[PDB]
Amino acid sequence: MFIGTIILVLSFLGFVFNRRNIILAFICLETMLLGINLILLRNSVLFDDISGSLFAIVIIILAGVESAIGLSLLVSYYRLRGVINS
Amino acid sequence: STPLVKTSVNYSYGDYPLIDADPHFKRVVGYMRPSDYGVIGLATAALPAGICFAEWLDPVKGKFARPSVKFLRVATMLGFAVGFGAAYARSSLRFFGVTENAREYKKDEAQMAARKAAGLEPYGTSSLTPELQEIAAKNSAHSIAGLFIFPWFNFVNHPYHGRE
Amino acid sequence: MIINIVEILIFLVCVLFSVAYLTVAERKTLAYMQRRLGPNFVGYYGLLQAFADAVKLLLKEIVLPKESNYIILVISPLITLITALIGWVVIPLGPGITLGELNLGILFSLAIGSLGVFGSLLSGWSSNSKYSLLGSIRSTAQLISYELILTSIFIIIIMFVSSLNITTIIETQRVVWYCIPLLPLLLIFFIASVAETARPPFDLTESESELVAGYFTEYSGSPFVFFFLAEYSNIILISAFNGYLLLGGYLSFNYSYLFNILFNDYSYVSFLFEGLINSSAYAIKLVFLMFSFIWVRAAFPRFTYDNLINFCWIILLPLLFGIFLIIPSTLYIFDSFPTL
Amino acid sequence: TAAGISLTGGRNRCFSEWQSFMHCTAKTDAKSRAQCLPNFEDYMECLHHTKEKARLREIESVLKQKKEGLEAPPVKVIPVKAIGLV
Amino acid sequence: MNTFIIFIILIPIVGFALLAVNILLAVYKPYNEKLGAFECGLTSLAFNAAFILVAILFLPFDLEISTLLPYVMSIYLVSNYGFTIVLLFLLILIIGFVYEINTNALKINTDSLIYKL
Amino acid sequence: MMYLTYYFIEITIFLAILCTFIISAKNPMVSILYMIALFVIAAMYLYLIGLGIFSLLYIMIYIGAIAVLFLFIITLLDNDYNTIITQDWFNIENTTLLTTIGNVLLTNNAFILLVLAIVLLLGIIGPISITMKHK
Amino acid sequence: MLILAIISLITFVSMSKLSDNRAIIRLINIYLILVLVLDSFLYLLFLNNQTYTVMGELLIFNSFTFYIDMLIYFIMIVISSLYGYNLYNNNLYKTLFEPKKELIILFLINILGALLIVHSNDFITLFVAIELQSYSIYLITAIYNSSYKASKASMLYFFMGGILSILIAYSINTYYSVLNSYTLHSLDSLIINTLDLNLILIALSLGLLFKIGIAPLHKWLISIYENTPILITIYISLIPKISILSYLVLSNISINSLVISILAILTLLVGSVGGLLQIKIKRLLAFSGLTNAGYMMLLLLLNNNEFSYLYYITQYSISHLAIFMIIIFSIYYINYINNQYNPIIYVNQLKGLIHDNAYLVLSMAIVVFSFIGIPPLLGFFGKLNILMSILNNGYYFISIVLIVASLISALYYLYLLNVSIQDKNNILINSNETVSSVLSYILSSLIILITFGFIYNSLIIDIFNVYFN
Ligand SMILES: CCCCC/C=C/C/C=C\CCCCCCCC(=O)O[C@H](COC(=O)CCCCCCCCCCCCCCC)COP(=O)([O-])OCC[N+](C)(C)C
Structure with a gap:
């Protein structure tokens, strides 16, 4: 609940107040998903319930495919411009 | 083949008596009427006839040309799939007691009586454990409702058929 | 605490010296396949050759090029070496005889392996020599592609055992080694372990003729020692994965009759004799595998990047998905789903 | 659904009172539903241990406000190595 | 403090010790010509789609392979039911693999001479 | 020694705050390496709460694949009380977290699995569709 | 049928050449038509408002979701026709409207995602369907990668959708942490009285609603709608709205919410x-879509919103398709094509269209006056049902504001007709070219529906009373 919450909020603030780069943006997305999942898994353990962990696995997989698609979008964006000035 | 959970008995999905709440794939295909085969044939003819008529109305490249054999073969394949889905749905709806089902009801009564005479289980013996049978039932029950989205069938010999 | 320390020192010394002598064994074997002698002069019969190279490289100046991130250039070899050595903590030399007896031993092996592409991915960025960059991108591509094949064979084997404890996987093979029913899978694991290790014929990553040296063009002294050590330690470790997945690990033969003849009760003598038998079986399997790495290096010319990518993604991966389909089908047909 | 399944495939930590509460909601109707509010507090209680933590708070508070000695068979903490010693 | 954790701690210490021995014993004389990057002895960026594509398609296929870990750890408990489910899962993924093959996704002067007489 | 394992949870939390160095990194690479460090801290915390298998899956996937892709691409482009732990003997099987996840995912939620198959199918078709120029 | 279509289509599009795109799309158009007509009889399952939980209580099937499903198929049929058929056979239109190779598969997968959002009975299914739709719609935004604006649009869309998806996942997990459950069905009047779930449920609703672009987070979506190819905008502006709104209406988790009222x-x-x-x-049309999404948001504050919502969503879908198709047709009479992704851009480019095509302007007038809500067009009855619902439930100030907002939006609705019935100097003399029969027939069918739907109002309410009571 603590580590996950702080990763979520700090990654969110990094995303919003980013005025440095787009890679920071990707990373904040990924780390937010991380924090969500950590909160989820702690709750799973405290309840001795499997639904929490099942949803954690599904988040893992969907974050994988989301990263794949997002990087593909970034590459297609780059193909036209040659440079990412953020 | 002893149920682990309680089910409704002879529940009315419609105006007609219930034959089977979750019929087995073999029964649903086995109870299909000649009209359902007509539906399958109509879809199988309609889909390539549809592509040809569409080409007639608005040719792809200005000048009319009959669609190639690859596309027509595709057309027949997918049309048969749609027809079979429609026909399966019609038969299952008969089983639930939503459409008229006198013929199917009588045939089921006879088949069940014969099976009981032979000493067999009314719904067959399953290679699964009862827990997996309840899970298969809860996964296949009323799955015909999502025919538009995904195809799902009952292939498991479970005892939750909603009868007495 | 003391016993733990002694076990770790014994195991660590054996692993480090085995890696050191694998280099000498490679030079000597290639030499005799090339009608020559190889190292026979530094130490008796060339047995101190590896330590000579070591000492020299530890006395060599470290050069940090001008455009380089020196921290990354020095730490990348260090992390690849650490992971290559950490991978050894789960390898058993007998039933339960390992530093780490994890119920997730297989998952640990795969994870620490997946931590193995970071040296290649990072050095090109650290060196900044252009040859290093080309080598680094091509290597990262090749390594991940063949890691897929290795993970898929891992999964196919666990289909037979339903356990992630390495000792259990080995014990299930007393009935038969898994390389007998799955001989084609054993061939693919070799072809892929060669590629995943970046050895010839698949040495495109650091091939001297296409690219001078490779990603290591800029690595002198101890960083070069680390890349070298990590490479040979990974060779031995992936031969270990092969050994316990497919060659029955530390199983050789049923020595129950023999022990009942020799001994009449349990004793430290008999426990030691059993330990030596199991460890000898596992080490002879490791030796045949290392010899095969050297043999293949001696026999074949290199692939090109396009060739190996085509291989992995068009010839190997379809076959592996086909096997994914056909192994559980055979289990289902004969009602032999393995229990936990 | 995976509701009710523990991390080991059994029944989770808080299954029994959840199942009691469902027995309620099955037997009762919307007008009568308030009739087993009690089963629901029991469920939330198993889940979050709130009244239990409050009761422990009052017990600790009064314990630390006491200078008189305690004469009751006590609780002893031992090292893990010392399980079964003596 | 079992053998596992002690070994895990011990390995990086050995790495750092070798590094420190190198730093302590080796000479260190940098100068501009030595610090230059080596490219065959003398001082001196578009890429193809398949470079991007190998890396990007690694992630879905890795996820597919690692999605079978729960299956192989529960094969007996899921019986002939889970068996069928995992066949369907595998075939659905095989379709995407077929698409990849047929589109040739990872792959990177014959005119005649005619005289106007 | 005992305060070590006691505060181990609080240490991972502190290192996670510190590592979230990701935002302030001068170099995006360096930012990605610090992201990897954050993921290792996450794996450490997961083991502590009892979910080590998840520590290993996280190492396998997020570091083994997602961080590898990140780096590939960017090289290319320009509550003070204590809980009572009690025993009971009703579990005779060797059922762990992975086995239970397999059980529920492949039987109770086969539908979620097949929909995930479609999602991975998307994760294949899409990148090909937008990164490759046909004909 | 939809899964089978997706699988087959992947196989074919793999094995077909780039010239076969339109023929493939015609094939799927006819297939969807065949499914809609042959499998329609499954409505009979839903007699007496019978609800079915399916797939182990992951999916829920009732008359409402069946209707939303049919509507989504009708929309997909119309949208695929625009790609499967050429307006004109000249070179210009081959350049203007060519379907990408994978576009149809992306369309079908996004439709599948939308249907799974509608039917979702459990939060895991909701989240997976949301992510499926979100990913497919990112890719549809990005598939026309020759456009600078389309790529910029896809990236902005990726990031905003990712943040909203994280808000949604956070809401789902907080609900889990409080109730150890993933289903709303576990909720009851007793539970809502006992526990304060308002914060969690409103966060979930807001995370879903900001994905269709409700204020104050509108502008990113309007920019995306502006910057995409016109035939892409016809799709991405509609399907997500339908799926998300239908899910929220079916779930009823924000009844009398003060925050939803203010938003x-x-x-x-x-x-x-x-x-x-x-x-x-297109920016004018996107703000139209925002106002109409507001009209539908009002229905999330009350129970028994099924009739008003279904009527409104159907008439809105028809009007939206029709207005986009009219803008598309009016392209043939412009004298300046701005670029190959968005041929017409400024409202003033329609000036004098009545002199080129009188009946196109007639259709335009009909659709615009439907949007304003002039009886007896469908738009009037949609607004009438909405007002009936909200006044029955005591939303007086919101009703006054709805009146005022319809008045204000009439101005930029009539802007289109105003410039369209003005006069242009160079008036078409003649042309041999014929607009494609199929799309003209479809546009005409939509227009006739908008015009003469009201004759079936009492029949519709009679049917509704037996399938939703
Ligand atoms: C031969 C099979 C062809 C059927 C294909 C249907 C395609 C749907 C495509 C688009 C939706 C377009 C209009 C839907 C009509 C609602 C039917 C209904 O009555 O709505 C009720 C529910 O009322 C509602 O909530 C309100 C609906 C809001 C409608 C707004 C538009 C009103 C004006 C339309 C006038 C109709 C034109 C006739 C011209 C001669 C559902 O009825 P139901 O669920 O029992 O299914 C009907 C039985 N069926 C499956 C065989 C067809």
């Missing part, structure tokens, strides 16, 4: 006021 008010005001100063056609 619906704000959305009405911003959609009406902000569209006034617009000069680009």
Whole structure:
């Protein structure tokens, strides 16, 4: 609940107040998903319930495919411009 | 083949008596009427006839040309799939007691009586454990409702058929 | 605490010296396949050759090029070496005889392996020599592609055992080694372990003729020692994965009759004799595998990047998905789903 | 659904009172539903241990406000190595 | 403090010790010509789609392979039911693999001479 | 020694705050390496709460694949009380977290699995569709 | 059928050449038509409002979701026709409207995602369907990668959708942490009285609603709608709205919510006021969509909203398709094509269209006056049902604001007709070219529906009373 919450909020603030780069943006997305999942898994353990962990696995997989698609979008964006000035 | 959970008995999905709440794939295909085969044939003819008529109305490249054999073969394949889905749905709806089902009801009564005479289980013996049978039932029950989205069938010999 | 320390020192010394002598064994074997002698002069019969190279490289100046991130250039070899050595903590030399007896031993092996592409991915960025960059991108591509094949064979084997404890996987093979029913899978694991290790014929990553040296063009002294050590330690470790997945690990033969003849009760003598038998079986399997790495290096010319990518993604991966389909089908047909 | 399944495939930590509460909601109707509010507090209680933590708070508070000695068979903490010693 | 954790701690210490021995014993004389990057002895960026594509398609296929870990750890408990489910899962993924093959996704002067007489 | 394992949870939390160095990194690479460090801290915390298998899956996937892709691409482009732990003997099987996840995912939620198959199918078709120029 | 179509289509599009795109799309168009007509009889399952839980209580099937499903198929049929058939056979239109190779598969997968959102009975299914739709719609935004604006649009869309998806996942997990459950079905009147779930449920609703672009987070979506190819905008502006709104209506987790009340008010005001100063056609239409999304958001504050919502969503889908198709047809008579992704951009480019095509302007007038809500067009009855619902439930101030917002939005609705019935100097003399029969027939069918739907109102309410009571 603590580590996950702080990763979520700090990654969110990094995303919003980013005025440095787009890679920071990707990373904040990924780390937010991380924090969500950590909160989820702690709750799973405290309840001795499997639904929490099942949803954690599904988040893992969907974050994988989301990263794949997002990087593909970034590459297609780059193909036209040659440079990412953020 | 002893149920682990309680089910409704002879529940009315419609105006007609219930034959089977979750019929087995073999029964649903086995109870299909000649009209359902007509539906399958109509879809199988309609889909390539549809592509040809569409080409007639608005040719792809200005000048009319009959669609190639690859596309027509595709057309027949997918049309048969749609027809079979429609026909399966019609038969299952008969089983639930939503459409008229006198013929199917009588045939089921006879088949069940014969099976009981032979000493067999009314719904067959399953290679699964009862827990997996309840899970298969809860996964296949009323799955015909999502025919538009995904195809799902009952292939498991479970005892939750909603009868007495 | 003391016993733990002694076990770790014994195991660590054996692993480090085995890696050191694998280099000498490679030079000597290639030499005799090339009608020559190889190292026979530094130490008796060339047995101190590896330590000579070591000492020299530890006395060599470290050069940090001008455009380089020196921290990354020095730490990348260090992390690849650490992971290559950490991978050894789960390898058993007998039933339960390992530093780490994890119920997730297989998952640990795969994870620490997946931590193995970071040296290649990072050095090109650290060196900044252009040859290093080309080598680094091509290597990262090749390594991940063949890691897929290795993970898929891992999964196919666990289909037979339903356990992630390495000792259990080995014990299930007393009935038969898994390389007998799955001989084609054993061939693919070799072809892929060669590629995943970046050895010839698949040495495109650091091939001297296409690219001078490779990603290591800029690595002198101890960083070069680390890349070298990590490479040979990974060779031995992936031969270990092969050994316990497919060659029955530390199983050789049923020595129950023999022990009942020799001994009449349990004793430290008999426990030691059993330990030596199991460890000898596992080490002879490791030796045949290392010899095969050297043999293949001696026999074949290199692939090109396009060739190996085509291989992995068009010839190997379809076959592996086909096997994914056909192994559980055979289990289902004969009602032999393995229990936990 | 995976509701009710523990991390080991059994029944989770808080299954029994959840199942009691469902027995309620099955037997009762919307007008009568308030009739087993009690089963629901029991469920939330198993889940979050709130009244239990409050009761422990009052017990600790009064314990630390006491200078008189305690004469009751006590609780002893031992090292893990010392399980079964003596 | 079992053998596992002690070994895990011990390995990086050995790495750092070798590094420190190198730093302590080796000479260190940098100068501009030595610090230059080596490219065959003398001082001196578009890429193809398949470079991007190998890396990007690694992630879905890795996820597919690692999605079978729960299956192989529960094969007996899921019986002939889970068996069928995992066949369907595998075939659905095989379709995407077929698409990849047929589109040739990872792959990177014959005119005649005619005289106007 | 005992305060070590006691505060181990609080240490991972502190290192996670510190590592979230990701935002302030001068170099995006360096930012990605610090992201990897954050993921290792996450794996450490997961083991502590009892979910080590998840520590290993996280190492396998997020570091083994997602961080590898990140780096590939960017090289290319320009509550003070204590809980009572009690025993009971009703579990005779060797059922762990992975086995239970397999059980529920492949039987109770086969539908979620097949929909995930479609999602991975998307994760294949899409990148090909937008990164490759046909004909 | 939809899964089978997706699988087959992947196989074919793999094995077909780039010239076969339109023939493939015609094939799927006819297949969807065949499914819609042959499998329609499954409505009979839903007699007496019978509800079915399916797939182990993951999916829920009732008359409402069956209707939303049919509507989504009808929309997909119409949208695929625009790609499967050429307006004109000249070179210009081959350049203007060519379907990408994978576009149809992306369309079908996004439709599958939308249907799974509608039917979702459990939060895991909701989240997976949301992510499926979100990913497919990112890719549809990005598939026309020759456009600078389309790529920029896809990236902005990726990031905003990712943040909203994280808000949604956080809401789902907080609900889990409080109730150890993933289903709303576990909720009851007793539970809502006992526990304060308002914060969690409103966060979930807001995370879903900001994905269809309600104020004050509108502008990113309007920019995306502006910057995409026109035939892409016809799709991405509609399907997500339908799926998300239908899910929220079916779930009823924000009844009498003060925050939703304030946000619906704000959305009405911003959609009406902000569209006034617009000069680009698609930005005008996007602000139209924002105002209409406000009208539908109002229905999330009350129970028994099924009839009003279904009527409104159907008539809105028809009007939206029709207005986009009219803008598409009016392309043949413009004298300047701006670029190959968005041929017409400014409202003033329609000036004098009545002199080129009188009946196109007749259709335009009909659809515009439907949007304003002039009886007896469908738009009037949609607004009438909405007002009936909200006044029955005591939303007096919101009703006054709805009146005012419809008045204000009439101005930029009539802007289109105003410039369209003005006069242009160079008036078409003649042409041999014929607009494609199929699309003209479809546009005509939509127009006739909007015009003469009201004759079936009493029959519709009679049917509704037996399938939803
Ligand atoms: C031969 C099979 C062809 C059927 C294909 C249907 C395609 C749907 C495509 C688009 C939706 C377009 C209009 C839907 C009509 C609602 C039917 C209904 O009555 O709505 C009720 C529910 O009322 C509602 O909530 C309100 C609906 C809001 C409608 C707004 C538009 C009103 C004006 C339309 C006038 C109709 C034109 C006739 C011209 C001669 C559902 O009825 P139901 O669920 O029992 O299914 C009907 C039985 N069926 C499956 C065989 C067809």
